[model samples]
Target: LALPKGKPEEGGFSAERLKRLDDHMQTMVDRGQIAGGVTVLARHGRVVQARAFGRRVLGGDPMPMDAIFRIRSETKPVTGVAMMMLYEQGLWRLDDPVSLHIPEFANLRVAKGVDETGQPILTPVSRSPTMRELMTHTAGFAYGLANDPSSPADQAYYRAEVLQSASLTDLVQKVSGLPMFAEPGQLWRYSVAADIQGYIVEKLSGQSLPVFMQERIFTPLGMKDTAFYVPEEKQARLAALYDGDPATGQLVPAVEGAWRDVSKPPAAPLGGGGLVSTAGDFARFAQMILNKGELDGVRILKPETVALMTQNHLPEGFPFAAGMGYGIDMAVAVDPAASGAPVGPGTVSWGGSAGTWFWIDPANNLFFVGMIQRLGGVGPGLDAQSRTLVYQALERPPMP
Candidate 1:
């Protein structure tokens, strides 16, 4: 279902001030910071801005309003919702041992440090990480994505080929043998926990991750353009990925790699960072969260379940930026000012490695989805810039 369009003023935004958002995006395009992008802003369930600027490729056709993006890690929030759906059905509890769902994790180990021979010194996990810890990233798992050469635990991930597994079961088996970065509930670390959650979803639901998400989340929310791979018919809408050339400071087509191959179904879909989506499609998903888990007469989750998913689940004294906390698979702005963003408290958000971002602001009854194809980094921080621009445009509080 498409979100109904509304005037900026009706959505509590200044029409003129909102143009700053568009202008900044356009300037990024003109300066080659990004080839092009799309942004969708909504308040009280009505869309006030849906825009596409610059070329889809460096010089190809204009970026379509429906252009698909590699929403990499942004996929985590969707997986969070998938897990929560099972929670509503009484499949699992927040404090249940993760080993209860994935027995392979029962005897997990922690990497204490390297021994004299340059091998990892492993110790037994004090206890199995809980479902809540898994969701909040305090579960002691390590993602192999870190490029630090000094970290034996990180290097061990590469040796294990953790991400090259044939399936979720294979992935779990590989992870089962590796040493975790920390003890359970010890500290927050971005991890492979969401991918692990994907496996649990498959185990408990008796369905593949893609099938479960399609039936439960995307279809119900009318997110037609969201999926792990783009079909042949829809492939033309896929945006070309780019990385900045450090020497020339210009956009270059990113190296062709396994992750860039979205033309066919992946053997093991990455629940942490696999989905692609359009601005309009993801806005529906975000709006559903803003609406407390239902949109357009479709209820994807219970209000209390969403509450459980969005609140600060982090342990006290865990280090995050002031006012920042992690909820299930996403970052929460527990205090907007202290977090240094201009959004309201209780805003939860996450972004993709390829520069896609979105946030659901419950206090303001709004959400924003920004899509870009640039990898590596975007100057001035697109997520932070857009946050400021969008909130500054709010001329008045949302109507009750």
Candidate 2:
């Protein structure tokens, strides 16, 4: 398994290792664990491998290189990057309290405990969460849907159809009435803080979340195939969503029943889980981060800002990010050994709920983007499998 003697960047890798990667994916598709997916690997700015497996839909078209996927929470890193663009403009500071911009969040309180009737009691928090906390998900917010269904916050978020709200303001209005999951800056809860970041983007930029992202992030990155919704003309390229059977690993087709509706615009653009993109489109965004906030001479942010985003920003005694430590919108590999991945220190990566996954290993001079559209069936294994194969093919690990 050792690489040949030479600099690994000379672009030599074992074809045998790559085929094993290929067979690994094909076998997953054959076993019905996933309908199909696309995997791409690149190093030193050159694409090393891009392969597709299985059908786009269970019994439909074969998966294409450009197949669209509803890249859930992966949108967090993108939105986090956008908020940092504002951070670069001096629009806000890393420590600025989110209440300063949203105002409605000024009165946030911590939930102490639930009552006998399942109502939550609240108490005043010590302080408001800062912008950096929101970007890093230390803010005391919850996704509502991810919470216990009987909890007051979860019920309110579901009753209001927060994801389908007509605007960010409306969503904020609904959330403003809910109680915090924990005191600000105290816990690492995966919540809707990114959605709040999107609202702040609207407030500071004077535009809708989608429009601001289009002009500032997507267009400049040449991410033409990425958006919150697929237009009628491009609907044919959208992959049908599926749910896999746990016992049999068989993918069952689902339309308009699982996840959000991607064929048309939502009532509101969700910063947390509201965009669809292809492997290539997202790779462009990842490359921009790897290149220190510039892609194709389009400077999105200064290298220093990217550095801050990828570095761990946690306070004392908080656990998150699988022990890797939380960053602005993704997890920083503070210790790859602790993370159980072959990644090196300073790697920045995250994934979506629909099985979409990716990683940027600056130390290794490589990155990988993978896509799939099933939920609840295939989970984090997609990320680990993708990482294991890509690293095994690395003829050289990054120099220490």
For each candidate in the order shown, give its overall lDDT on alpha carbons.
0.87, 0.80
Q: Which stretches of candidate 2 lie over 4 Å from their true place?
A: 1-12, 147-152, 246-249, 255-259, 319-322, 377-379, 397-399
Clashing pairs in 2: none
Which runs in model 1 stand beyond 4 Å of their true positions? 397-400
- Measured on C-alpha atoms, candidate 2 has an lDDT of 0.80
Best by lDDT: 1
Per-residue lDDT for 142-177 in model 1, tens only?
Answer: 876775656777777767767667898988988888
Model 2 lDDT-worst window of ten = 1-10
RMSD of each: 1.7, 3.8
